[PDB]
Amino acid sequence: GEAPNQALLRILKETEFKKIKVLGSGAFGTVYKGLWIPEGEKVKIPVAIKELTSPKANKEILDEAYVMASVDNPHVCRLLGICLTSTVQLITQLMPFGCLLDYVREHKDNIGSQYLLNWCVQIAKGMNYLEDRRLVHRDLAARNVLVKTPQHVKITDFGLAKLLGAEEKEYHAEGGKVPIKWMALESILHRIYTHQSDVWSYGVTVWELMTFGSKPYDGIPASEISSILEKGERLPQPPICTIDVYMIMVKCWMIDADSRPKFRELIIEFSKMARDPQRYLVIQGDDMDDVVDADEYLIP
Amino acid sequence: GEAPNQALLRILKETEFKKIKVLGSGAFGTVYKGLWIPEGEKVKIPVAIKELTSPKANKEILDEAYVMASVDNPHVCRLLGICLTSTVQLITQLMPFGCLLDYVREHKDNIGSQYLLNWCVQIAKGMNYLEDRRLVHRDLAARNVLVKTPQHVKITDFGLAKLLGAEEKEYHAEGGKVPIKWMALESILHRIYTHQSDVWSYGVTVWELMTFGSKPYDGIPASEISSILEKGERLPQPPICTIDVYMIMVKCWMIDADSRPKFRELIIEFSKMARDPQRYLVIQGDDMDDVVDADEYLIP
Ligand SMILES: CN(C)CCCC(=O)Nc1cccc(-c2c(-c3ccccc3)oc3ncnc(N[C@H](CO)c4ccccc4)c23)c1
Numbered sequence: 001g002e003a004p005n006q007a008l009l010r011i012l013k014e015t016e017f018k019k020i021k022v023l024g025s026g027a028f029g030t031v032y033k034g035l036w037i038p039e040g041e042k043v044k045i046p047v048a049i050k051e052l053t054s055p056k057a058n059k060e061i062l063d064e065a066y067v068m069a070s071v072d073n074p075h076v077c078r079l080l081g082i083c084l085t086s087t088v089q090l091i092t093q094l095m096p097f098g099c100l101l102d103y104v105r106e107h108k109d110n111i112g113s114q115y116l117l118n119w120c121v122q123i124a125k126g127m128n129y130l131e132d133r134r135l136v137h138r139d140l141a142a143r144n145v146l147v148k149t150p151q152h153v154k155i156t157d158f159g160l161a162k163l164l165g166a167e168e169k170e171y172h173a174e175g176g177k178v179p180i181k182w183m184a185l186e187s188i189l190h191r192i193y194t195h196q197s198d199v200w201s202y203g204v205t206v207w208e209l210m211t212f213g214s215k216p217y218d219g220i221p222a223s224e225i226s227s228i229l230e231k232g233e234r235l236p237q238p239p240i241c242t243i244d245v246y247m248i249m250v251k252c253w254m255i256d257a258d259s260r261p262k263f264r265e266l267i268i269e270f271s272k273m274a275r276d277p278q279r280y281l282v283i284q285g286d287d288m289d290d291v292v293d294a295d296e297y298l299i300p
Numbered sequence: 301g302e303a304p305n306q307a308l309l310r311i312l313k314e315t316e317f318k319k320i321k322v323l324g325s326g327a328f329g330t331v332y333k334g335l336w337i338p339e340g341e342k343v344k345i346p347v348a349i350k351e352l353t354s355p356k357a358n359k360e361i362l363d364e365a366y367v368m369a370s371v372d373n374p375h376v377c378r379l380l381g382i383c384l385t386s387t388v389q390l391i392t393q394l395m396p397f398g399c400l401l402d403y404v405r406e407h408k409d410n411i412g413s414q415y416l417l418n419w420c421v422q423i424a425k426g427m428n429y430l431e432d433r434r435l436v437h438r439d440l441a442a443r444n445v446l447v448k449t450p451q452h453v454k455i456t457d458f459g460l461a462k463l464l465g466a467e468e469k470e471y472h473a474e475g476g477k478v479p480i481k482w483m484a485l486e487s488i489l490h491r492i493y494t495h496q497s498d499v500w501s502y503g504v505t506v507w508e509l510m511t512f513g514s515k516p517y518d519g520i521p522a523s524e525i526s527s528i529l530e531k532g533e534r535l536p537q538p539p540i541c542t543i544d545v546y547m548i549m550v551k552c553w554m555i556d557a558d559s560r561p562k563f564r565e566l567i568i569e570f571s572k573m574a575r576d577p578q579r580y581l582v583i584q585g586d587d588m589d590d591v592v593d594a595d596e597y598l599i600p
């Protein structure tokens with residue numbers, strides 16, 4: 001009827017792995033840095049460990065496990081396993097440089113156009129993988145893209161992700177509590193989510209990167225966003241962005257979802273731009289200008 | 301009778317230059333970071349400014365000015381000028397990375413053998429220049445070599461330097477107060493200073509670099525150093541040093557000063573070693589070893 005999901009859910013013993021330090025905490029619970037040492041082999045795998053014993057929350061962690069266990073792509077984070085302790089723990093590959101949002105914020109002065117454009121390509125590849133797997137992410141943002149190395153990023157945080165049937169094109173949400181400033185207008189108005197609603201969020205994610213981590217609609221409270229977007233207002237053209245790049249962003253933000261580009265198209269277009277990055281992003285780097293070194297100023 | 305010293309002593313107005321920050325203070329006085337802007341030209345020269353009104357000290361500052369004004373070489377710091385304020389100020393090119401001693405101490409983990417050996421060559425070139433100018437430095441150490449860039453260092457601090465006559469081979473000091481752990485044995489015993497006594501100090505300076513800024517004879521008080529050296533004891537072979545390199549150090553430390561190498565020989569020998577650095581210095585860089593990244597550990 002539909003393709004059997006034959007993904008393997010690996011169960012790990014708590015004794016196999018070692019918590020080293022807390023990486024962060026919040027409403028999601030807390031995330032630890034750790035080492036995972038399977039008894040049989042001589043390997044030590046660096047890992048991130050996530051835990052929250054509420055009933056609804058336990059169901060949600062396992063829903064997140066299902067999705068991470070079912071994805072396998074170089075630009076998306078996979079679940080390594082779970083540990084069934086007093087509270088359930090998710091285990092995944094450590095992404096040492098943290099989320100991309102924080103990375104761009106505290107490396108503005110050393111991030112070149114080659115890296116910005118390559119990230120855009122990589123995220124588009126991960127999303128296209130997810131689309132092929134009939135999976136709608138529903139929470140794409142710079143904070144949900146992690147950095148394994150500065151040249152390799154991965155999509156993560158599938159806590160809102162939803163699978164789709166072969167005979168199904170959208171997902172009608174309920175209750176909500178979704179990040180408003182990253183979601184498509186049809187999602188705000190009618191709680192509809194598509195692969196093309198993820199493309200909107202991709203647009204906003206790209207906007208974050210090009211603005212080096214600025215908050216979208218900084219001065220605006222969530223309740224207005226709907227009407228602003230209804231009026232035809234969008235995120236402004238970032239300083240470093242040529243019209244070429246900003247045109248792609250704007251295309252991701254059109255009312256007619258089918259008019260928006262597909263992730264495979266976005267891969268291609270950003271791939272093209274990555275071949276000649278300084279034509280498409282204008283960055284200063286890539287105090288006074290009359291300064292001269294003493295041993296080039298010779299006796300007059 | 302002897303070669304006229306036709307060096308120019310440039311006098312600068314205090315209004316020409318701008319103190320930006322104190323770089324350091326001590327018995328020498330204080331040194332400021334600054335910018336020098338000659339009124340006529342559109343240049344802004346980064347400079348270091350040094351001031352101490354004692355009578356003997358004023359004579360000494362001017363003696364230091366004489367020497368710095370009389371040297372011109374890429375591996376020695378020249379005097380740009382002096383400013384005749386309430387107290388006299390020496391002005392020279394800023395060496396932004398500070399003294400080499402501090403540099404090696406706080407970059408151990410990122411200093412490769414190529415840099416260590418090249419520095420050794422550069423210092424030897426500067427000293428050979430000084431020898432040609434008939435000038436005996438008398439205070440060569442890692443602290444008196446400044447870093448313009450990580451790949452270009454310069455000799456400085458001529459406060460003990462002495463000029464020599466064409467018919468003269470040594471300098472008999474008086475009073476003293478000279479750094480004991482860097483000076484040759486004949487200087488400790490008989491207050492004699494030569495170009496070959498500077499070579500001893502060069503040996504100790506190289507030892508500092510190869511030990512990444514260790515204090516020579518760390519546990520020993522100054523009064524013993526004479527007898528230790530008299531007994532045949534020397535600084536130990538640093539961990540990273542091949543016998544080839546340590547042999548050069550030891551040669552710099554022989555009783556018979558004429559047996560010690562000349563700076564021109566030291567230039568050559570270290571130059572040769574700089575062509576294949578990892579043959580002559582063994583450094584680890586140039587936690588566990590069973591660590592494996594999660595996306596190279598595939599499902600068993
Ligand atoms: C609530 N979310 C929608 C927003 C997530 C933003 C966030 O705070 N992410 C986050 C928080 C804490 C840790 C990590 C994380 C890090 C990390 C490493 C160094 C410094 C800072 C963060 O590395 C990671 N590697 C893999 N996953 C990570 N976190 C996700 C959950 O965000 C995760 C999911 C499942 C299992 C393990 C970890 C991570 C990532």
Ligand SMILES: CN(C)CCCC(=O)Nc1cccc(-c2c(-c3ccccc3)oc3ncnc(N[C@H](CO)c4ccccc4)c23)c1
Pocket residue numbers: 323324325328331348349350377390391392393394395396397398399439443444446456457
């Ligand atoms: C007492 N001496 C035998 C030991 C000197 C060790 C020392 O403290 N040197 C020192 C002290 C203060 C400033 C400098 C210096 C720096 C510098 C820059 C950044 C951070 C730290 C230090 O840069 C310099 N560029 C040129 N000369 C410098 N100092 C020498 C006197 O050490 C100097 C001599 C004459 C005029 C100006 C400066 C310097 C160098």
